[PDB]
Every structure is written in C-alpha cells, then in structure tokens.
C-alpha cells in the first residue's frame, strides 16, 4: 500500500527525490577530498642532543 | 570505488520494478498502466525490501 | 520468494512451485546480475595509475557474481525443494 | 588602488575582515529557503504551479 | 504510471535478436531446474564437492 500512496502522488514522490539529490549535491561540495581515509598511524618525534 | 560498485546495484530494485510492468502489460491487454504499476508493487515490494 | 508464493498462495506443489519461480524470475535475476557484472567490468580491465587496486577489487567480484548468477540459480530451487519437502515430513 | 603600487597589498582585520569576507553571501541563504519553500509546498499540495 | 506507454510495438533489431536468444536461455534454464530437481541426491553431492 506504501507504493500506492506515491503512485497517486508523483509530485510528492519526485519532490522527495529532488530534495535528496539537492541535499546530496550540497553535501558532495562540502566533503573533504583525501586520497585515503586517515589510516596511517600518527607519529610523534622526540629529539634530544648530547 | 564503492560509488562505482553502486552504479550496477543502485539500479536493481528499479529495473526489477520496470521489468514487472512490461510483463504485466504484455500478459494483460486490458489493464491500465497506473493499475499495472499498483499491481506490480504488490508483486515485487517484498523482494525489493 | 516467488516459489514461496506458489506454495502457500496458489497451493502449487513444491516441484511445481520451484520450477515456476525459476521460469518467471530468471529475467530479473540475470539483467540485474548483468547490470552489476558489466558495471564492475571496466575495473577488471583496469589500465594505468591505480590499476592494482581496481584489479584487486574487480577480479574476485566478477567471478563470484558470474558464479552466483549462473551456478547458484540452478541450485537455489533445489534447496528450496528439499527444505520444503522436509518441512512437510516434519509436520508428522 | 589609486595610491599604492602593486608590490603592495591590503589585508583587513577585525570587523572589516568579517564584512569583506562575507561579501554577498545573503544571495545563497535566500535562494536556498525559496527553493525549499517551493518544493515542500508542491509536495504537500501535489501541484507544481500552485 | 504516467510515462510508461501502453505498447511499443517495434523495438529495433539487435534488441529483438538479443531478447530472442535470451528467451531461449530461459527455457534452457527452467529445463535445467527441471532436471536437477529429479536428481536430488546426485546434485547435493556436487554442492559438497
């Protein structure tokens, strides 16, 4: 019956499709571009001199 | 990489739906397309879930 | 799912159900599996910078999909058949 | 722009920084809310033109 | 509902040939399950292999 509701209401069905796309297009823009996730161990370097 | 793998998975549930329209539309030369679509979603809702 | 439909919604026999499920659901099973397989295909033929990562991702994926969209669809009706044939002996 | 040779530049700080940097960003929030008023209504009333 | 049409009587040529060959394979496939279901114990082994 769920699909029926939308089959009656193509404007509603497409408006949900549109907002999803539009929110996801804004999101695509504001995502960071790495090359890999942060999957190398962080590394601290301590240095003394005698 | 996953976005690429998605292309051929993302269309699955939609093409499953649309194949079940040409099939209802072919085996019933009386029904209306709107009524076929309602009937197909009674037939293929459970598997697309 | 369709085999389950024919047995407890059209009353058809286990054999009659499994065969009907195969016949009527073959086309969607393939063209979706064909849609995926041909989709990961340009990664198995990958060429140039970053190839090994696409080559690794794509290779086992295609073969296992091809396998499960040919060898498996012949067998799933069998396992449905036996499991349903078993559940009616278990009734006793 | 008149007084200074181009081996010079002119960086803002304080209140002027905030104002210069946010220049003409009100167009974005307004257009955003109008687009989302439009779609949300079109769905609720199942008509585009209305 | 409001864009699929009641019929598309003729759809190109290679599309026609491809689907002819594809309908044949459906019979070959359903003929395969027909086979395998009669040979139960024999095919459960090929699985465990």
The answer to whether C81 touches C14, Cβ cutoff 8 Å, is yes
Residue C39: how many other CB atoms lie within 10 Å: 20
Instruction: With CA atoms as reference, report the closest residue to E2 among A9, C87, D18, B2.
Output: A9
Instruction: With CA atoms as reference, report the closest residue to B15 among B26, B47, C54, B31.
Output: B47
The answer to whether E1 touches A10, Cβ cutoff 8 Å, is yes
For residue E18 the two structure tokens come to 């491809």
**Chain-chain contact of B19 with C38 (C-beta, under 8 angstroms):** no
φ/ψ region of D24 (left if φ > 0, alpha if ψ in -120 to 50, else beta) reads left
d(CA D9, CA D3) in angstroms, rounded, equals 11
- Chain C nearest C-alpha distance from E33 (Å): 6
For residue A16 the two structure tokens come to 């949900």
Can you give the resolution of this entry in Å? 3.2
d(CA A3, CA A15) in angstroms, rounded, equals 15
- Give the technique used to solve this structure: X-ray
d(CA E39, CA E48) in angstroms, rounded, equals 15
**Chain-chain contact of D48 with A11 (C-beta, under 8 angstroms):** yes
Instruction: With CA atoms as reference, report the closest residue to A27 among A36, A19, A17.
Output: A19
For residue A45 the two structure tokens come to 């370097």
Q: What is the dihedral of CA D24, D30, D32, D35, to 10 degrees?
A: -140
Nearest CA in chain B to E1: B34
d(CA C14, CA C85) in angstroms, rounded, equals 7
For chain D, helix, strand, coil in percent to 5 are 55, 0, 45
Longest dimension (CA), chain D: 61
**Chain-chain contact of D48 with A9 (C-beta, under 8 angstroms):** no
**Phi and psi (nearest 5°) for D23?**
-65, 125
| The 3-state secondary structure of chain C, one letter per residue | CHHHHHHHCCCCCHHHHHHHHHHHHHHHHHHHHHHHHHHHHHHHCCCCCCHHHHHHHHHHHHHHHHHHCCCCCCCHHHHHHHHHHHHHHHCC
Nearest CA in chain A to D28: A26
């Amino acid at each position: 019956m769920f699909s029926k509701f939308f089959i009656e209401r193509p404007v509603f069905a497409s408006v949900v499709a549109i907002i999803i796309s539009l929110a996801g297009a804004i999101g695509l823009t504001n995502l960071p571009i790495e090359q890999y996730p942060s999957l190398t161990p962080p590394t601290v370097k301590v240095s003394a001199t005698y | 990489f996953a976005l690429i793998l998605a292309i051929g998975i993302v269309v699955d549930d939609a093409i499953i739906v649309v194949e079940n329209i040409d099939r209802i539309l072919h085996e019933n030369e009386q029904i209306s397309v709107k009524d076929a679509a309602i009937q197909a979603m009674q037939e293929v809702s459970s598997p697309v879930i | 799912e369709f085999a389950m439909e024919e047995r407890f919604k059209k009353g058809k026999g286990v054999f009659e159900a499994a065969v009907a499920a195969a016949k009527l659901r073959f086309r969607p099973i393939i063209m979706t599996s064909l849609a995926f397989t041909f989709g990961v295909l340009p990664m198995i033929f990958a060429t140039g910078a970053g190839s090994a990562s696409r080559h690794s991702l794509g290779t086992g994926l295609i073969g296992g999909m091809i396998a499960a969209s040919t060898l498996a669809i012949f067998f799933v009706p069998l396992f449905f058949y036996l499991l349903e044939n078993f559940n009616e002996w278990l009734d006793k | 722009k008149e007084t200074l040779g181009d081996d010079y530049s002119i960086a803002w700080s304080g209140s002027a920084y905030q104002e210069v940097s946010s220049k003409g960003t009100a167009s974005y929030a307004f257009a955003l809310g109008m687009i989302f008023v439009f779609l949300i209504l079109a769905a609720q009333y199942e008509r585009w033109l209305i | 509902a409001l864009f699929l049409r009641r019929n598309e009587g003729e759809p190109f040529k290679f599309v026609k040939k491809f689907n002819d060959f594809f309908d044949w394979s459906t019979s070959v496939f359903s003929a395969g399950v027909a086979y395998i279901l009669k040979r139960t114990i024999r095919f459960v082994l090929i699985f465990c292999i």
